[PDB]
Each structure stands twice: as structure tokens, then as C-alpha cells.
């Protein structure tokens, strides 16, 4: 797919530090556009992207209302989950939720999704049919029964297919100058000043948006996992990201190797030696 | 725009 809209929720209990904290964050791809934090004295939804600032005070009061409601809902949910697991008021617990809509290159709905976790572990997730739930345990089965009586799946499917897609298209249009613009990486091969028999080959990529990239090192055949140092895609501070790949060569016959890139911002994949 | 149905677990 080309573009996606996602909302990230965190509800955290904290004995001795006040009432449970609720944080809600909205993203269009890798760009944050909305933030709500219940920890403020008078909490309200905040704009986090320039293209969202144009939205009227009605949009902001509607966002503030559901996030104020969710603060209260998740407080009760943490209390109910403590009960299902026979946990006392002593410990700190976290409920996490991630939901959203994925649009294909055509700009149509490819995938609608929703997943919830408890203490960093899968709890309840909406199925691919968007009509049923997968409950990870017996506690999540009690949540499922409540959510079935409340008609959550029907109203969530309708939102994911309708309003989610509709509003993501509005955001993509309003933010077209920064969101529908994909920057390509600056590629180069290097080698660090090492000692004897400690030589290595390092492939680099340094300036890109989106973060999706594929760096592979193969020339004669296909080594794959066989001695290929993979590094996690690390951010820069704007929209920029970074990534590198390595292969061991403790002697001197390294012209027989080739690095390959796959970023979508480039016209076609590059070959590096 | 977020999901506008808040349901207790």
C-alpha cells in the first residue's frame, strides 16, 4: 500500500502517582498529527502537523470529547482487567491499542485493522473479516462478550471502511506537499580504519522518507543470513531515516561483492561495490 | 479522525 492512518492508545495505572494516564496519538504514515494527554490539568487534543491546524474548533472539541471519554473508559478497563487476572491494586499495568486503515497505491481500502494488548502482550484483535474477534486468553473472552453485546465489530468495520478512509484522504490532500513526497537515499560504501585481519565491508543509506528500505549484500551467489550484519532503521530528526549493512572479510579478496538497495523514492534499484 | 465508540473491557 501507499498510505495509512493509525491511532495509538496507551492507558497506564500508576499506584502513588495519581489516576491512570491516557495518551492518544494519531499518525498519517510516519507523521504525527494529533496528541492527547490526560496528565494536563485541563486536557485537550493538540495539533502536531501544519496541515491539521486548519481544522475548525468543532473538530478539536469532537477529538477532545472521545479522548476524555476514553480516559474514563480505560480507567474502568484497567480495573476490570486487574479483576480478570486476580491482580491487586499494588502493581502498574498498561493497556495498548492500535487501529487504522491502509490505502493501496490506487487510494482504496486495502486493510482495516485493530489490536489491543495488556502488559505488552496480545489481548484482543479484530479479525481480517472485520466481523469477529481473536481473544488471546480467558480474560479477553470476557471482554469479547462485552464488545459483542455493544456491537463494537459492526461499528468499527463501518468506521474503518467509511470515516477512516474518508478522513485519511482529506489529510493526504491537505498535506500533499509533505505527505505525498518521497525523498530518496544517499548511498555509499565504506571501511573503518582497522587493525590487520579485522577488515569488513559496510553499505550505507542515509536520507529517506518513508522508512521502508531493503539493503542486501550478494554478488556470486545468494548468502542471505550467512554473515550479513543487519541494523535497525534508525530515525534522523525531520522525516529522515538511516540504515546500514555489513559483511566480514578478514583477508583481501572483496571486489567480488555487491550491495543492493530497494527504496521506492529512487527511479530503479542501485548497484554498489 | 479517531473511532468514536469507547467501550469498557
Amino acid at each position: 500500500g501507499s498510505h495509512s492512518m493509525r491511532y495509538f492508545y496507551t492507558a497506564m495505572s500508576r499506584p502513588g502517582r495519581g489516576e491512570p494516564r491516557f495518551i492518544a496519538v494519531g499518525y498519517v504514515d510516519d507523521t504525527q498529527f494529533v496528541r492527547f494527554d490526560s496528565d494536563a490539568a485541563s486536557p485537550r487534543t493538540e495539533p502536531r502537523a501544519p496541515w491539521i491546524e486548519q481544522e475548525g474548533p468543532e473538530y478539536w472539541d469532537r477529538n477532545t470529547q472521545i479522548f476524555k471519554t476514553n480516559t474514563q473508559t480505560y480507567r474502568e478497563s484497567l480495573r476490570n482487567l486487574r479483576g480478570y487476572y486476580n491482580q491487586s491494586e499494588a502493581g502498574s499495568h498498561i493497556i495498548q491499542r492500535m487501529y487504522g486503515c491502509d490505502l493501496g497505491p490506487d487510494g482504496r481500502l486495502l486493510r482495516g485493522h485493530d489490536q489491543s494488548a495488556y502488559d505488552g502482550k496480545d489481548y484482543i484483535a479484530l479479525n481480517e473479516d472485520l466481523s469477529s474477534w481473536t481473544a488471546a486468553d480467558t480474560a479477553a473472552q470476557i471482554t469479547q462478550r462485552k464488545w459483542e453485546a455493544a456491537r463494537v465489530a459492526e461499528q468499527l468495520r463501518a468506521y474503518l471502511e467509511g470515516l477512516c478512509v474518508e478522513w485519511l484522504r482529506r489529510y493526504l490532500e491537505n498535506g500533499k506537499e509533505t505527505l505525498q513526497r518521497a525523498d530518496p537515499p544517499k548511498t555509499h560504501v565504506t571501511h573503518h580504519p582497522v587493525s590487520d585481519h579485522e577488515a569488513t565491508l559496510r553499505c550505507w543509506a542515509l536520507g529517506f522518507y518513508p522508512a521502508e528500505i531493503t539493503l542486501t549484500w550478494q554478488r556470486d551467489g545468494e548468502d542471505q543470513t550467512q554473515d550479513t550484519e543487519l541494523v535497525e532503521t534508525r530515525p534522523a530528526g525531520d522525516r529522515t531515516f538511516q540504515k546500514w549493512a555489513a559483511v566480514v572479510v578478514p583477508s583481501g579478496e572483496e571486489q567480488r561483492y555487491t550491495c543492493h538497495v530497494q527504496h521506492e523514492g529512487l527511479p530503479k534499484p542501485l548497484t554498489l561495490r | 479522525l479517531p473511532f468514536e465508540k469507547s467501550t469498557v473491557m
Partner: T-cell receptor
Framework: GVSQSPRYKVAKRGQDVALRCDPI?????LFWYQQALGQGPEFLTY????????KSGLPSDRFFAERPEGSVSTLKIQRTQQEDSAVYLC????????????FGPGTRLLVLE | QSLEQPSEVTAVEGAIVQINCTYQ??????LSWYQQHDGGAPTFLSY????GLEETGRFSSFLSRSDSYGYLLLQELQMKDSASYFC??????????FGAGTRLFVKA
């Protein structure tokens, strides 16, 4: 089911009135509605447990709603006026908004000079 | 952010009656139906979130989100069916908008 008291009430203009609602046990959501003759219920206030999340529908600041323990709710009207004359309905939903609503029989309030 | 339904409808015992409800909203979440007897509590009949037909005994309710309308169909009408029927629109959050109501008169 949801219970309400008193079923009927006649009040003198300027006197205070207290309307009681006892919703279904365990129901998280509580609603208060005003119903005028030949019309549908109009939203007054919303609760989830003890927290009053919205009171945008209250006609005056003379109206005060409470649900201190997150169960029984009271709708208090200070210095009652003739315009306050209506049927006051309370409702409950098991786990939140946009759900099936369970209503009480209401309080039919009439305020006279 | 509104909805419309007929003011009154008269039908004979044993017959059928359809109450139509049209709404206008930008963020629809559900259409529901409630029956209220004079000086009584409104009681839940049916709820339509997605497009389709909800069937509960003699009563049924339909929804067409693209055409912004729904209806309640009462079959094998009885004397006890004489009441006010309210259609209700949910538009996200918790604040439900109820229609003015349709008073049904069942003739013996």
C-alpha cells in the same frame, strides 16, 4: 430494569426539586433526558461510572446532576420555574456509548405559580 | 444533524404498518428504534449499525446508509402495539438524537 422516583411531582415556582434514578447494576453509562409533550427525549447529561463527561443539554445552571458512587443518580433543580415542567427520563447502557439504552419510567414534573 | 419520521399512523388489527425514518448526518454510527406507551418508559426494539435487516419476531428494521434512511415494519398488528415509535440516530460519542416520534393507532 431502571427505576425512577417520584413517578409524578407538582412543585411551587421557586422551590427546589430532587429527581432520583436507580439504573441497572453494573451499567457503566448513565443518561438523563428531558421529554416535552409530543416530542422525543432530548439529551441532558452523560455519566460513565461517577464521572460526568458532558452536561451540554442542561437548560440552566439551576440544574445539577450527580452519580457519586457510580450507581444511583440524582437530578436536582434549584429555584424551579414553569419552563422546567417536563418528563425527566434516565437511561443506562452496559459498557459505553452507541449501545442499547435501558430507560426508567420517568418523573413527570409540573411547576406551578 | 437531524432526523424525520411521520407524526401519526393508523392501521387495523391483524394488518401491517411501516414507519419510515430519514436522517441527515456527516458521521453516522447507528439507527435504533424505541416503543413508548403513554406515560411509560421507551423500550428498545432494534438497532442497525451496518446496512441490512434486523428481524425480532413480528417487528423488523432496515437500514440503507447511502440513501440515509431506515424503517420499522410492524406485522400481525395487535391492540397492545398502539404506542409512540421513536427512531434514534447515533453519530459517535454518546449523545443520541431522537425523532419527534410516530404515534400508531391500532383499530379493533
Amino acid at each position: 430494569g431502571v427505576s425512577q422516583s417520584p413517578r409524578y411531582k407538582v412543585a411551587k415556582r421557586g422551590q427546589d426539586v430532587a429527581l432520583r434514578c436507580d439504573p441497572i447494576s453494573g451499567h457503566v453509562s448513565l443518561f438523563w433526558y428531558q421529554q416535552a409533550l409530543g416530542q422525543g427525549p432530548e439529551f441532558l447529561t452523560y455519566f460513565q461510572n461517577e464521572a460526568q463527561l458532558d452536561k451540554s443539554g442542561l437548560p440552566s445552571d439551576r440544574f445539577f446532576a450527580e452519580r457519586p458512587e457510580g450507581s444511583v443518580s440524582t437530578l436536582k433543580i434549584q429555584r424551579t420555574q414553569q419552563e422546567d415542567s417536563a418528563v425527566y427520563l434516565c437511561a443506562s447502557s452496559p459498557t459505553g456509548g452507541q449501545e442499547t439504552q435501558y430507560f426508567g419510567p420517568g418523573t413527570r414534573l409540573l411547576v406551578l405559580e | 444533524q437531524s432526523l424525520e419520521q411521520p407524526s401519526e399512523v393508523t392501521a387495523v388489527e391483524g394488518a401491517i404498518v411501516q414507519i419510515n425514518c430519514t436522517y441527515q448526518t456527516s458521521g453516522f454510527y447507528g439507527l435504533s428504534w424505541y416503543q413508548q406507551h403513554d406515560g411509560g418508559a421507551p423500550t428498545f426494539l432494534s438497532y442497525n449499525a451496518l446496512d441490512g435487516l434486523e428481524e425480532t419476531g413480528r417487528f423488523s428494521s432496515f437500514l440503507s446508509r447511502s440513501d440515509s434512511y431506515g424503517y420499522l415494519l410492524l406485522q400481525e398488528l395487535q391492540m397492545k402495539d398502539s404506542a409512540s415509535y421513536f427512531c434514534a440516530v447515533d453519530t459517535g460519542g454518546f449523545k443520541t438524537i431522537f425523532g419527534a416520534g410516530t404515534r400508531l393507532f391500532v383499530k379493533a
